[PDB]
Design a protein around this ligand. Structure first.
Ligand SMILES: [Cl-]
Ligand SMILES: [Cl-]
Ligand SMILES: [Cl-]
Length: 232
């Protein structure tokens, strides 16, 4: 009974939820309690049921939604823009037998692995409340897109909804995947560049390997690359 965890698209199949992996295989839950996850994208932990385009699975944990917001705005300081107030640890961590970095899920979706620092809380309610304070927004500044541009550059804007000193104290290591539907971004990129698709998407992050202080001399900028692929 092979086991697997990973990022999947969430399907609404006439009211029942199924999933689709990055290879395009539909994963059909056979759990006796219905899946009720309301997300566009998810992280699941599962096993393949015995008796082998669709595979029946048993979920081994409650599915987790991982949707995050991608926006376009013309430049820094305009409507919808977000100001970073915390550094990530990295946009990479260990998944399976290797490290994973920002990657392409489908023509419409990309995924950021985020390694970051949270407050040390212990009640289930508190942990859930703490996690909700962290928002990872990808921003495309459309004024920066010029005619012919083959590179789509996105800024990770990471905001913690807490006071500056409490942000600085966070030290508990956490990992999460964040999935971004980027069709609207791609549409705007096409209109400004005249290109049908970018050769690559770049993700620009403020990260700090040592502490959670944004204005620390250890905070660096790091650019992660995604080679953008299509069936066409
Ligand atoms: Cl569920
Ligand atoms: Cl509790
Ligand atoms: Cl570049």
């Amino acid at each position: 009974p092979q086991q697997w965890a990973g990022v999947v698209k969430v399907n609404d199949r006439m009211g029942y939820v199924t999933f689709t992996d990055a290879a395009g295989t539909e994963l059909i839950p056979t759990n006796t309690i219905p899946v009720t996850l309301n997300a566009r994208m998810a992280y699941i932990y599962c096993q393949v049921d015995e008796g082998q385009k669709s595979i029946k699975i048993t979920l081994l944990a409650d599915p987790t939604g991982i949707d995050a917001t991608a926006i376009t705005t013309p430049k820094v300081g305009e409507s919808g823009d977000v100001t970073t107030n915390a550094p990530v640890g990295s946009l990479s961590f260990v998944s399976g037998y290797s490290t994973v970095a920002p990657f392409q899920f489908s023509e419409n979706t990309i995924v950021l692995p985020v390694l970051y620092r949270v407050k040390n809380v212990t009640t289930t309610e508190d942990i859930k409340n703490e996690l909700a304070k962290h928002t990872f927004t990808l921003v495309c500044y459309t004024d920066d897109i010029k005619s012919g541009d083959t590179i789509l550059k996105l800024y990770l804007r990471y905001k913690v909804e807490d006071e500056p000193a409490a942000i600085a104290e966070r030290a508990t290591r956490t990992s999460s995947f964040k999935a971004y539907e980027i069709s609207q971004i791609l549409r705007e990129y096409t209109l400004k560049s005249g290109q049908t698709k970018p050769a690559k998407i770049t993700i620009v992050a403020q990260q700090n390997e040592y502490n959670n202080k944004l204005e620390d001399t250890s905070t660096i900028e790091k650019v992660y690359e995604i080679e953008y692929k299509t069936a066409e």
